Design a protein around this motif. Structure first.
Motif, mmCIF file in Angstrom:
data_model
loop_
_atom_site.group_PDB
_atom_site.id
_atom_site.type_symbol
_atom_site.label_atom_id
_atom_site.label_comp_id
_atom_site.label_asym_id
_atom_site.label_seq_id
_atom_site.Cartn_x
_atom_site.Cartn_y
_atom_site.Cartn_z
ATOM 1 N N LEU A 207 -2.546 3.008 -18.007
ATOM 2 C CA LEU A 207 -2.760 4.223 -17.405
ATOM 3 C C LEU A 207 -4.313 4.655 -17.070
ATOM 4 C CD1 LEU A 207 -1.213 6.437 -16.272
ATOM 5 C CD2 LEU A 207 -1.162 7.473 -18.805
ATOM 6 N N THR A 208 -5.203 4.101 -17.824
ATOM 7 C CA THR A 208 -6.688 4.569 -17.576
ATOM 8 C C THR A 208 -6.920 3.641 -16.398
ATOM 9 O OG1 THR A 208 -6.933 5.005 -19.984
ATOM 10 C CG2 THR A 208 -8.819 4.204 -18.743
ATOM 11 N N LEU A 209 -6.584 2.631 -16.199
ATOM 12 C CA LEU A 209 -6.794 1.699 -15.322
ATOM 13 C C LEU A 209 -6.487 2.263 -13.994
ATOM 14 C CD1 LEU A 209 -7.824 -0.772 -13.734
ATOM 15 C CD2 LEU A 209 -5.698 -2.120 -14.597
ATOM 16 N N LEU A 210 -5.114 2.501 -13.782
ATOM 17 C CA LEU A 210 -4.649 3.561 -12.718
ATOM 18 C C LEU A 210 -5.564 4.668 -12.362
ATOM 19 C CD1 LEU A 210 -0.856 2.886 -12.860
ATOM 20 C CD2 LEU A 210 -2.388 1.989 -11.182
ATOM 21 N N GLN A 211 -5.836 5.545 -13.495
ATOM 22 C CA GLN A 211 -6.497 6.761 -13.328
ATOM 23 C C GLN A 211 -7.802 6.477 -12.724
ATOM 24 O OE1 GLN A 211 -8.115 9.130 -16.327
ATOM 25 N NE2 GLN A 211 -6.584 10.418 -15.888
ATOM 26 N N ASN A 212 -8.674 5.600 -13.322
ATOM 27 C CA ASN A 212 -10.036 5.226 -12.664
ATOM 28 C C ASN A 212 -9.997 4.442 -11.552
ATOM 29 O OD1 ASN A 212 -11.309 5.925 -14.966
ATOM 30 N ND2 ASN A 212 -11.176 4.108 -16.248
ATOM 31 N N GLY A 213 -8.739 3.685 -11.226
ATOM 32 C CA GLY A 213 -8.756 3.323 -9.490
ATOM 33 C C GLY A 213 -8.769 4.631 -8.697
ATOM 34 N N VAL A 214 -8.048 5.649 -9.008
ATOM 35 C CA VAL A 214 -7.731 6.803 -8.179
ATOM 36 C C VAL A 214 -9.361 7.343 -8.145
ATOM 37 C CG1 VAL A 214 -6.773 9.172 -7.919
ATOM 38 C CG2 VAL A 214 -5.523 7.243 -8.638
ATOM 39 N N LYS A 215 -9.993 7.444 -9.390
ATOM 40 C CA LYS A 215 -11.269 8.224 -9.434
ATOM 41 C C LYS A 215 -12.398 7.340 -8.470
ATOM 42 C CE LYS A 215 -14.739 7.771 -12.816
ATOM 43 N NZ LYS A 215 -14.956 7.887 -14.279
ATOM 44 N N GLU A 216 -12.430 5.973 -8.563
ATOM 45 C CA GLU A 216 -13.278 4.967 -8.068
ATOM 46 C C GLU A 216 -12.974 4.783 -6.520
ATOM 47 O OE1 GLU A 216 -13.079 1.637 -10.792
ATOM 48 O OE2 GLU A 216 -13.908 2.872 -12.393
ATOM 49 N N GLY A 217 -11.745 5.497 -5.848
ATOM 50 C CA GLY A 217 -11.601 5.388 -4.630
ATOM 51 C C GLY A 217 -11.030 4.158 -4.119
ATOM 52 N N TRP A 218 -10.202 3.280 -4.878
ATOM 53 C CA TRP A 218 -9.425 2.019 -4.556
ATOM 54 C C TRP A 218 -8.030 2.079 -4.705
ATOM 55 C CZ3 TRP A 218 -6.962 -0.566 -8.544
ATOM 56 C CH2 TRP A 218 -7.417 -0.575 -9.499
ATOM 57 N N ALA A 219 -7.706 2.923 -5.315
ATOM 58 C CA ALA A 219 -6.290 3.277 -5.615
ATOM 59 C C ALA A 219 -5.742 4.648 -4.905
ATOM 60 C CB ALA A 219 -5.794 3.140 -7.145
ATOM 61 N N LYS A 220 -4.576 4.519 -4.226
ATOM 62 C CA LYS A 220 -4.036 5.648 -3.551
ATOM 63 C C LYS A 220 -2.801 6.079 -4.086
ATOM 64 C CE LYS A 220 -2.856 7.510 0.882
ATOM 65 N NZ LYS A 220 -2.354 6.918 2.160
ATOM 66 N N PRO A 221 -2.617 7.256 -4.710
ATOM 67 C CA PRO A 221 -1.336 7.805 -5.277
ATOM 68 C C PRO A 221 -0.458 8.020 -4.118
ATOM 69 C CG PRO A 221 -3.017 8.984 -6.241
ATOM 70 C CD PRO A 221 -3.614 8.184 -5.030
ATOM 71 N N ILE A 222 0.963 7.793 -4.205
ATOM 72 C CA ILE A 222 1.951 8.096 -3.005
ATOM 73 C C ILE A 222 2.640 9.000 -3.638
ATOM 74 C CG2 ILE A 222 3.562 7.206 -1.651
ATOM 75 C CD1 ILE A 222 0.733 6.263 -0.650
ATOM 76 N N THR A 223 2.785 10.267 -3.411
ATOM 77 C CA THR A 223 3.550 11.333 -3.836
ATOM 78 C C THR A 223 4.685 11.947 -3.082
ATOM 79 O OG1 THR A 223 2.017 12.960 -3.093
ATOM 80 C CG2 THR A 223 1.465 12.115 -5.309
ATOM 81 N N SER A 224 4.863 11.338 -1.905
ATOM 82 C CA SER A 224 6.033 12.016 -1.176
ATOM 83 C C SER A 224 6.435 10.662 -0.302
ATOM 84 C CB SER A 224 5.620 13.005 -0.093
ATOM 85 O OG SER A 224 6.595 13.498 0.645
ATOM 86 N N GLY A 225 7.713 10.430 -0.703
ATOM 87 C CA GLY A 225 8.266 9.202 -0.239
ATOM 88 C C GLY A 225 7.941 7.681 -0.680
ATOM 89 N N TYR A 226 8.741 6.800 -0.314
ATOM 90 C CA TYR A 226 8.366 5.422 -0.926
ATOM 91 C C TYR A 226 6.852 5.004 0.060
ATOM 92 C CZ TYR A 226 13.320 4.890 -2.404
ATOM 93 O OH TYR A 226 14.332 4.999 -3.171
ATOM 94 N N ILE A 227 6.432 3.999 -0.478
ATOM 95 C CA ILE A 227 5.302 3.612 0.234
ATOM 96 C C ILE A 227 5.448 2.971 1.425
ATOM 97 C CG2 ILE A 227 3.598 1.410 -0.147
ATOM 98 C CD1 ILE A 227 3.806 1.658 -3.043
ATOM 99 N N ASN A 228 6.746 2.291 1.748
ATOM 100 C CA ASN A 228 6.955 1.829 3.179
ATOM 101 C C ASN A 228 7.137 3.122 3.902
ATOM 102 O OD1 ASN A 228 9.413 0.917 1.108
ATOM 103 N ND2 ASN A 228 9.858 2.253 3.148
ATOM 104 N N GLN A 229 7.386 4.334 3.569
ATOM 105 C CA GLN A 229 7.682 5.384 4.321
ATOM 106 C C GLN A 229 6.007 6.054 4.337
ATOM 107 O OE1 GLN A 229 10.618 7.449 1.940
ATOM 108 N NE2 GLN A 229 12.333 6.615 3.179
ATOM 109 N N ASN A 230 4.998 5.707 4.091
ATOM 110 C CA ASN A 230 3.727 6.248 4.214
ATOM 111 C C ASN A 230 2.800 5.456 5.101
ATOM 112 O OD1 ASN A 230 3.114 8.849 2.168
ATOM 113 N ND2 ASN A 230 4.975 7.772 1.561
ATOM 114 N N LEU A 231 3.125 4.203 5.304
ATOM 115 C CA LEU A 231 2.532 3.285 6.035
ATOM 116 C C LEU A 231 2.045 3.708 7.245
ATOM 117 C CD1 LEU A 231 4.058 -0.256 5.006
ATOM 118 C CD2 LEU A 231 2.159 0.629 4.016
ATOM 119 N N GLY A 232 0.606 3.353 7.864
ATOM 120 C CA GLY A 232 0.388 4.052 9.106
ATOM 121 C C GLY A 232 -0.708 5.187 8.821
ATOM 122 N N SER A 233 -0.683 5.919 7.592
ATOM 123 C CA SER A 233 -1.672 6.853 7.333
ATOM 124 C C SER A 233 -2.854 6.154 6.230
ATOM 125 C CB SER A 233 -0.918 7.719 6.411
ATOM 126 O OG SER A 233 -0.867 7.504 5.009
#
Ligand SMILES: Nc1nc2c(ncn2[C@@H]2O[C@H](COP(=O)(O)O[C@H]3[C@@H](O)[C@H](n4ccc(=O)[nH]c4=O)O[C@@H]3CO)[C@H]3CC(O)(O)C[C@H]32)c(=O)[nH]1
Ligand SMILES: [Cl-]
Ligand SMILES: [Cl-]
Length: 397
Positions: A207-233
């Motif tokens: 969980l710390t790895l993922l939270q640090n990835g969000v902080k460090e700007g390399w991991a993007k949380p997808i909160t609305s829809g499947y990842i495949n419904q977010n591609l293009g943004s």
């Protein structure tokens, strides 16, 4: 008039015996591939049909099965996860499959082991997925970045590509399934001495790895829809996602989609993927005649051609050895190196706990701890300590 489900409705209207199959496919290739299988089965029977009944998603399905018992009217068959089988077994609600006469020789042991409870098989593995690494082949070539084979390499690649593209390129849902990839590959285990543990050191690390990835700007949380419904943004490089995503990623991606085996601890072997998707169970409440339809349908499902067509249409993992020897399977794998990639990943496979309370825990307790840490910067240990206490309270209840 002529859609597959229209044809099934006309077939079942003519049939003497109809065995209902409740499922959680909302659409896409999975729904189409299930319906095509059923149309073909129903053509082969004199007046003995299967009627697939969509119940929404998988959690809507289990809720509806629970209510069907309370209403006293269950379907002959349904999809079930291992946790759902555990729950239905407390109510003695499931027929042993081998009692029915379904032959299970040649089903992948991985899968058969998961549906065996007190040494008895209670499900037929049907639509079994594995997590794979989806990636953007174009974006990795643009910067000279090899497909990462280790977790170290994957983090390094995400950082390098995020800096080059000005946004986080590793896309994830903040959920129990994505957490399992990181947890399992950092050496995590959910059961310690038979006890469910959500707040182990490897859970905190994951969980710390993922939270640090969000902080460090390399991991993007997808909160609305499947990842495949977010591609293009925004720029995308990588995701860890179910192999049953494959058709949805292929249709959505405006870049050259790649599929790889998962990054592992070392290059000695791929990382473990979470097995998801479902098994078919047969309910005790069915008539002998409906149960005989279920037996023929389950033997058809496990036939090499039916497995070959279903798996290559969807990105599910063929569940039998005979499916890999079927020429339709072989032809598709020869044209499409991703099927093979999905089968090789299926060799490095882990399951979540097969506990009656696990569906509730994974979404409402563990998934909520992961959302608190990722979306609201809750302290990872504090969030998982809370999860652990809610899980213990629920199990002791
Ligand atoms: N109820 C309940 N669900 C559970 C349990 N363990 C895991 N899961 C869920 O299994 C889904 C994986 O199952 P799978 O069959 O591999 O994939 C599904 C869909 O995920 C995927 N799909 C659908 C539409 C789309 O645009 N993109 C796409 O990828 O396609 C398939 C058919 O719908 C995960 C997803 C989740 O539902 O968020 C939570 C996970 C459990 O114990 N109970
Ligand atoms: Cl560059
Ligand atoms: Cl585990």
């Amino acid at each position: 008039m002529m859609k597959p489900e229209d044809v099934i409705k006309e077939q079942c209207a003519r049939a003497k015996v109809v065995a209902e199959l409740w499922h959680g496919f909302t659409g896409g290739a999975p729904k189409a591939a299930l319906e095509n299988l059923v149309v073909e089965f129903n053509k082969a029977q004199q007046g003995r049909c299967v009627r697939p009944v969509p119940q929404g998603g998988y959690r809507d399905l289990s809720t509806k099965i629970k209510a069907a018992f309370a209403a006293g009217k269950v379907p002959t068959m349904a999809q079930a996860f291992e946790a759902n089988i555990a729950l239905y077994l407390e109510a003695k609600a499931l027929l042993p499959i081998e009692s029915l006469g379904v032959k299970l020789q040649g089903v992948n042991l991985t899968f058969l082991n998961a549906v065996r409870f007190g040494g008895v098989v209670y499900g037929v593995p049907f639509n079994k997925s594995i997590q794979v690494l989806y990636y953007n082949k174009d974006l990795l070539k643009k910067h000279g970045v090899p497909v990462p084979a280790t977790l170290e390499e994957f983090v390094a690649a995400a950082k390098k590509l995020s800096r080059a593209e000005g946004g986080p390129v590793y896309w994830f849902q903040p959920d129990a399934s994505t957490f399992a990839y990181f947890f399992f590959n950092l050496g995590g285990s959910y059961l310690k001495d038979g006890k469910l543990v959500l707040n182990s050191k490897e859970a905190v690390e994951a969980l710390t790895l993922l939270q640090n990835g969000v902080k460090e700007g390399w991991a993007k949380p997808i909160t609305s829809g499947y990842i495949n419904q977010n591609l293009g943004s925004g720029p995308y490089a990588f995701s860890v996602d179910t192999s049953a995503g494959y058709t949805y990623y292929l249709r959505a991606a405006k870049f050259d989609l790649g599929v790889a085996t998962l990054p592992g601890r070392t290059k000695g072997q791929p990382g473990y993927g979470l097995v998801q998707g479902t098994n078919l169970v047969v309910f005790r409440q069915a008539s002998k005649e409906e149960q005989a339809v279920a037996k023929d349908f389950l033997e058809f499902v496990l036939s090499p051609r039916a497995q070959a067509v279903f798996a290559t249409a969807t990105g599910y993992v063929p569940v039998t050895e005979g499916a890999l020897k079927d020429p339709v399977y072989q032809a598709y794998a020869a044209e499409n190196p991703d099927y093979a990639t999905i089968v090789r990943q299926s060799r490095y496979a882990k399951f979540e706990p097969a506990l009656a309370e696990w569906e509730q825990i994974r979404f409402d307790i563990l998934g909520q701890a992961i959302k608190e840490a990722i979306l609201n910067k809750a302290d990872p240990k504090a969030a998982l300590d809370r999860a652990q206490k809610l899980a213990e309270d629920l199990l002791s209840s």
